[PDB]
Each structure stands twice: as C-alpha cells, then as structure tokens.
Amino acid sequence: IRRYTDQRSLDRSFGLVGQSFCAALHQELREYYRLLSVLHSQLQLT
Amino acid sequence: ITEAALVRDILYVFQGIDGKNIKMNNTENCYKVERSLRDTAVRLSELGWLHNKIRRYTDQRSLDRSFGLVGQSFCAALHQELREYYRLLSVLHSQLQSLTLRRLLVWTYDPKIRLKTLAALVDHCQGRKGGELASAVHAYTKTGDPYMRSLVQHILSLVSH
Amino acid sequence: KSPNVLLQNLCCRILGRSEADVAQQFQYAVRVIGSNFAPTVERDEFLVAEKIKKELIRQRREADAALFSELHRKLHSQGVLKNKWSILYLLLSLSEDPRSYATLFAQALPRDAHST
Amino acid sequence: MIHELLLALSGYPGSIFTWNKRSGLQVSQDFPFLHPSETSVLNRLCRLGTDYIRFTEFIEQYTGGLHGIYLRAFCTGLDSVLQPYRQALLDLEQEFLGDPHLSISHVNYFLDQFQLLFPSVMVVVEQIKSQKIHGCQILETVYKHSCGGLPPVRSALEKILAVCHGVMYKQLSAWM
Amino acid sequence: LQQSLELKRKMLRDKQNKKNSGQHLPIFPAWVYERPALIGDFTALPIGTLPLASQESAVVEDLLYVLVGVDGRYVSAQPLAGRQSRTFLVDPNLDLSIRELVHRILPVAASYSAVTRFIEEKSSFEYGQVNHALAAAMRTLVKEHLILVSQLEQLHRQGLLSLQKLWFYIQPAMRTMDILASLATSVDKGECLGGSTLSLLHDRSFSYTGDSQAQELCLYLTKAASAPYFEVLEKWIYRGIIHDPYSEFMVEEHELRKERIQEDYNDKYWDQRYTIVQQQIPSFLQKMADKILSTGKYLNVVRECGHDVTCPVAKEIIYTLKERAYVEQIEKAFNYASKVLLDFLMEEKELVAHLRSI
Amino acid sequence: LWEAALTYEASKRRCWERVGCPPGHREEPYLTEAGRDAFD
Q1: Which chains sit next to F, with 3 or more Cβ pairs under 8 A?
Q2: What is the DSSP string of D88-122?
Q3: Which positions 100-139 of D are in contact with F (Cβ < 8 Å)?
Q4: What is the 3 state secondary structure string of chain C?
Q5: Contacts 24+ apart (CB under 8 A), B63-69
Q6: Using CA atoms, how far apart are residues E287 and E326, in angstroms rounded to an integer?
Q7: How far apart are CA D169 and CA B57, in angstroms?
Q8: How far is B23 from B142, CA to CA, in rounded Å?
Q9: Partners of E251 in the beta sheet?
Q10: Residue E242's Cα: distance from chain center in Å?
Q11: Any CB–CB contact under 8 A between E182 and chain A?
C-alpha cells in the first residue's frame, strides 16, 4: 500500500480523482505510524 | 560550558561589541566563537554586524549640519527605528529570573528583515540630499513584500516633511 | 472551595440569574466540564505567548503585543502562579475584538504518541 | 546602585564615575554581574550626563565680559528644556523600586531622545560662549538652530527662544 | 552560488532600457551575496557504538538541528550550497534499523534547504512585485516551521522523545514542504516573472481539487501574489494609468504621436499605440484580453479632449478559484467606458454633421 | 475566600532599600507623633 502511494503522486496522469483516491492512502499510512508511536511509549512488553 | 553565558554574550554582540568567548578578528568577518554551538552562533550575530553600519551612519550624519535638514530627517527616522531594537533587548534582559528557543533563533528572525532593508538603504542613499535623496527612497516602494512596503512608507512620510 | 459549587458561581456570574432560578445550564455545565477536569494536551506557554503575538499582529494591534512582551516578564517576575498556561490559553480562547487559518499553524501537544 | 547611576546622571557621581574637568564620568571598576562589554554601554550613557553637568555650571553663574539680562533669560529657558529630563529621572527610580529585573537597557532606550537633544543644544551653548554673543543678537544665534532637522532640537530651542523675544518687548515698550 | 548574480542583471536590463528616465534602478548591496549566514542551511565521538536507548535520543537531537538548516555533530550536511540541491552524510556506523529510518526522515530537510534560498533570491527588486509577494507568503510557512521545531525541542528537553514519535510528528510538515519545494522548483525552472508566474500559479492552483490539503496552500500563495497585479489592474481600468516598474502587465504603451498631429492615417490611438502582450496574460483573462486594453484606452482618449474622468464604482478584487466576481465587474466598467466615449463623440464634435456634409 | 480577601488596598510607606516589594511597614515613628498614650 505504501508502494502504490509513492507512485501515484509520482503521476500527474493518474487523475484528479486519483489525487482524491490517494488522499485516503496518506491517512492510511499516518494512522499506522501513530500506532507504532504509541507502541513505542509502552516499551519500557508481551 | 553552559548555554546561558553564551546567551549573555550574544545579547551584547548585537550592539557591536564582542563577547567574552566570542570575538571578531577580521572586520569583514562576523563574530566567531573562540562545536555545533559554534556553528549555531553566527546567524544570530549577523544582526549586530548589520547594526554597526546603520548605527555609525545615523550617528555621523545627525551631527553634520552641512549635510542639510533633509537627511538629518533620515537620521531622525533611523534613530527612532534603533530605539525599538533597544526595547527588545531590554525585554530579553529582564526576562531572566532553557528560556530561549533555539538560542533565540526564532525571536531574532523578524528583526532580521527590517535590518537588511535599512542596511541596504544607507548606501543606496549615500551622498544625497533633497529630491535626489527622496527619489532613492521612492525606488524602494516598487517592492511587492507587504512588510517591507509598510516599513518604507512611514520613513518616507517623515523625511519629505 | 470545591469545584462543583465554583462552576455554579461561574453560572451565576455570566448569567444575571441566581442559582435557584436555573438548573439546566448547570446541568449542561456538569455535562461539558466533566471528564475534562485537567488539560488533555501538554502545556506550551511559550507558544501561547506567541499566539497572542500572532493574534495581535493579525489584528494589526502591534503595539499591545509589545506591551504584552513586558507583561509576560512581570508574570515571570512575580511567580505566584504555577498554571500560567491555563488562564492565558483560556483568555486567548475567549478572544473578543477591541475594534483566516490556524489549520496550518501549530496546535497544542496532543499526546497521540504516548499512552495516556 | 539604582540611585548611584541616577545621580551620576544628575550631578553627583561618586568614585565609580570619577569626574574629569575636560569630560568625566570615567569607569574602570570591575564587577562579575556587569558584563565585560557593558562598560562600553555605560560609556555611551555617560555622554548624556556630562552635558547636563556642564549645563548646571552655566546656569549656576547666571540668573565687563559676557553678561546682561539675556544670560539671565536664555538660561531660564534652558531650565524648561531640562524639566522632562528631571521628570523622567524621577519616574525611573519609582519604577526600579518595584521591579528588580530591569537592566541598564531600560534607562538606555527610555532616555534615548536626549542623545539628540543634549549634543545639538550643547553646541549652541558652546558657540555662545566662545563667540561674543551677549546682546540682542542672541535670538539670531539660536534662531538658526531652532529650525533644527532633528525633532528634539527642533522643539527645545524654540522654548528657550520665546523668553528672549519676551525681553525684546520690554525694551521696545520703554523705547516706544 | 555564482548563478544568482547573473539572473538579476539580465532581468534588470529589460527594465533599464524599458525605462527612459528611470535610471539607476535599485539593487541590493554586495554583502547580501557575500555573507552566507543569511540562509538557514549553510561530542564528535561515534554514536553508533552506544546502546540503543542512548542512540535514539542523540539522533533525535542531531536531526532537530538539521531541520532548521544547521549541521549536527554526528551527521553532516555535505557541501552543495548551489542549486536547489542539498546533500547529507549520515554517520557511517549505526544500527541499520535506526539508519534506514534516519534516511527516511531526510527528504524534508532537502525540501527545506531548497525552500530557504528561494526566499532570499526572489525578493530582490530585479525579480518583481508578484515574485516578492509569493516569497513573502512562503516565508510565513517557513516561520511556522521554526515555530513547530521549538515545541519539539521542549518535549525533548523533558526526556520524552524518540525516533518513531519524531517520524510521526514530521509527517504533516513533510507534505507541506513538498508542495512548497515543487512549486519553487517550477517557478525557477521556467524562469518566469510578472504575469507568467501568475499563469504558473493559476494552473498549479487548479491542479489539486482531489486532495484539498495542497489546494489551500497554493491558493493562499496565489492570493498573496495576485495582490499587486490586481491593484495595477484597478489603476488601469478605473482611470487610465499604468507604470509597470518590473514587468507584470499585459498592456504596454508604444508612442507614435510624433510623426503627425491631429490626423491619423492608421487610427493609431485605436490601433498600434496601446498594444497587448501575449505572455503577461495570467491565463484566465485571455477571454477578456482585448476588453481590458480598450477599457483603459477609451478613458485616456477622452481625458485628453477635456472631459472629466469617471468610473462607475471603485472596487477591490481578489483571485477566486471557481466563481469569478472580478470578471463581471470588469464587464460593467467596460460597457460604461465605451458608453461614455460614444456619448462624448455623438454630442460634441459630432459625427452626424460630419457624415451629412460629406 | 482567598479572592474575597484579595480585593483589599495595600499600604504605602514605600522604602528605598526594599526592591523586592516595598509596600510599607513604618521605619520607626516619631516620639511625640504617637501621643495621648506615650504622653502618660
């Protein structure tokens, strides 16, 4: 999913609806990294 | 070394007098620390290196009465600008009981632009009086930066009185 | 005193009415203040000083920002306050014109990277 | 210390700001709490004090050689220009009693408008002594610098000049 | 490095020959170019042999310096102060897990270093008022970045910052800095100034309608850069007067009232005196491109005869994407101008008696 | 209760030597100018 997002913003022919589709492919990486951050805080786990 | 002693020094190299472990050895150069801290200091001391020129010129021409009334007016405007710089430095002195943010890199940034413009103007208007001087200030409102146009347009209203 | 009666005192302060004349507003007050009896963010008193500056320049009331620059020093100089963030953030929140965007300007530290 | 400076500004400097007859208020005393570069700041400030000190001597002799009634009038307007220089000195110590955190910079910016007032009036005072301007030609010698070009000296010498005109309506009433 | 000194003089020569009494136009002095500490991007023991939970705090601290342009002490920015490029050398010994993420955090630093030079270069007089205003509005977001990094420094000061948290914090600013850096590269690359860098910004402003995260950034930069041009436009429309200090405007004035007086063999006033320029059209006024000239030309050729200047209503106009209000205002003023000139023609010095007596 | 007590007027008789908050505490009154009890 990150491979795709890295390429569709490297295309200006994927569309003005492709830069709408890709908008909820940025949020879908941002929330993942948020979750890794919260996981980092409680390390000092099973 | 602790950071706060360096804050004390950099608050004085704004005036154009060297600090205790920051000294300037070449006149073209700027104030150098005498490792990452050493790299950080120079951007802050730029404002004092600019300050020396403007201060020396509005000191000199104000006592000159063969220079004429026009431009003693320029010195009037420049002097009133320098007073506000000193107001800032006093607030910064008094606020001690970190406290500085990036060693005040975010603070000095807004005076930096209004120092750059006034540092340009003095050699752009060097050796002029009257309408010859006034035209070189009217040149500086062909700019398209709102803050710089605002900075220039009150100085012009003073000098052409 | 105690917080619950202090909120009732606030309700009798802003409204002209007394506390035995209104009970829905105090009910709405216990609804909203409740489970938020502490800041949900982390304090940045420096930024909220910068936000009063960023506000007064935005109004082009630039002289009172430089007046606040000395009043903040007086705040530090006295030092009877350990919550300088709360009242000043609140005063900024109740902002009224003496007479844009903040979606790109930075907001308070949300603690979404720390287990609250 | 917050009266020693505010008297070295006026007329009594002590041993920290030793007076010299040519021009005084010299500093060589060391303190850890005054910055090593702050001696230069204090030297910038003492220029202001020397002119006030000389002004006080000039008023002390007045109010032959150079004499008349104009030296007893021109000095009296020189009082009136120095009055916001005294009021703003009282205000300072009133402020410093309450807040201890205000530094040398506060007196520096606050009394920065007399670094245009004091030298450009001092040149008029020295000119009237070195030259022999002590009759009714005093109004001319001030009337060329009252036009000014810096706003403090534009406003001060007028306030002195009005009283000299006031002497010129008593000669021209007895005569006329 | 050297290349900036070239561009300004080439741009300045057009306005120096264009101006026929405007001699010695303003330029910035030499120390603006000599001194390198006016851009933001101009102990030493190896951190890699330390334990992990020392390494994370230390790397966050160094990168925090790298963001605002100055180097670290364990990572160095490699010397590439010329073009919009900037390179970095990460420490050659590090835990690979950390080092990969460090490389991943690096792109926003290059898309900061490119950004900060542009603000210095295209605010000088040779670059023109619209290019000044665009620089003045991206500088606000640079100041905003300086605002964010201090809060990060405060959180790190209380010992509660590590690399995963830092990556999560920098993700919103990375997109913003990316939009600004791509726009900066586009503006310098076409070497466009005046109204051409309203066309570039018009197309770039239309380009995002699906994201709307980047549409607001560019739309604000367009409002700021369209501010001077619209004022010159209001001068031209509502009375008659253009100055054009640094070329940003489509109308230019070529004088021909030198050869003969009060006869026209070409009708040069109505023809090749006041002409249009194809490339200073900001690419949304191409439809109105003739009417904008005719409106202001009609007023000069009636203020010359001795008639009073009039405008219907003086209004200030802004750039709006999707629903123009400025165009409809221009149409009303244009009709009023043509009506006034025709009114003046058909009553005094009338064409009716002329045509009858022919 | 605390804010209710707060609304009071603080004394004068300022002192030069107090730089840290000089409201007033009377630098030793005069002997006669405390009369009618000092007298007897």
Answers
A1: D
A2: HHHHHHHHHHH-S---HHHHHHHT-THHHHHHHHH
A3: 100
A4: CCHHHHHHHHHHHHCCCCCCCCCHHHHHHHHHHCCCCCCCCECCHHHHHHHHHHHHHHCCCHHHHHHHHHHHHHHHHHCCCCCHHHHHHHHHHCCCCCCCCCCCCCCCECCCCCCC
A5: B63/D119, B63/D120, B65/D149, B67/B129, B68/B129, B68/B130, B68/D149, B69/D147, B69/D148, B69/D149
A6: 13
A7: 43
A8: 39
A9: E276
A10: 20
A11: no
Stated as kind and residue range, the H or E segment containing E332 is: helix E326-347
Q: How far, in Å, CA of E69 to CA of E80, rounded?
A: 13
E262: left (phi over 0), alpha (psi -120 to 50) or beta: left
Subunits with 3+ C-beta pairs closer than 8 A to A: C, E
Identity of the amino acid at E223:
K
The length of chain D, given as a count of residues: 176
Collapsing DSSP to helix, strand or coil, D76 comes out as helix
Closest by Cβ to A33, choosing from E168, E208, E213: E168
Is B161 in the D-facing interface, judged by CB distances under 8 Å?
A: no
Give E282-287 contacts, CB < 8 A, sequence gap 24+. E282/E195, E282/E198, E282/E199, E282/E202, E282/E226, E282/E229, E283/E198, E283/E199, E283/E202, E283/E203, E284/E202, E284/E324, E285/E250
Resolution of the structure in the document, Å:
8.7
For E289, residues 6+ apart whose C-beta sits below 8 A from its C-beta are E250, E276, E281
- Nearest CA to B116 among E285, E258, E29, E257? E29
C-alpha–C-alpha distance, residues C12 and C4, integer Å: 13
Instruction: Enumerate the residues of chain A whose CB falls inside 8 A of the CB of residue C114.
Output: 37-38, 41
Determination technique for this entry: cryo-EM
Q: Which two tokens stand for residue C107?
A: 């907001």
Nearest Cα residue in chain F from D1: F17
